[PDB]
């Protein structure tokens, strides 16, 4: 019982971490485009 509940919690944490991950990727690419504009 506990094993499965813990796995479900780990899945929810996975979901949150992925959300944060591609959010950070978006921020990265935004700053990167800004970097290229500043280089230009």
């Amino acid at each position: 019982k506990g094993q499965q509940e813990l796995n479900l919690q780990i899945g929810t944490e996975l979901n949150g971490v992925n959300a944060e991950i591609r959010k950070e990727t978006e921020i990265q690419e935004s700053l990167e485009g800004k970097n290229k504009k500043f280089d230009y």
Binding site: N7, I10, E13, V17, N18, E24, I27
Partner: peptide, 29 residues
């Protein structure tokens, strides 16, 4: 059950590290 729990935990850790590294890189940019 057990092994899937451990695998999910581990992968979650590595993706958290990826998140933290992306945060470092965004800050540095």
């Amino acid at each position: 059950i057990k092994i899937e729990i451990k695998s999910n935990k581990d992968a979650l850790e590595e993706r958290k590290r990826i998140l933290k590294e992306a945060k470092e890189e965004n800050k540095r940019i």
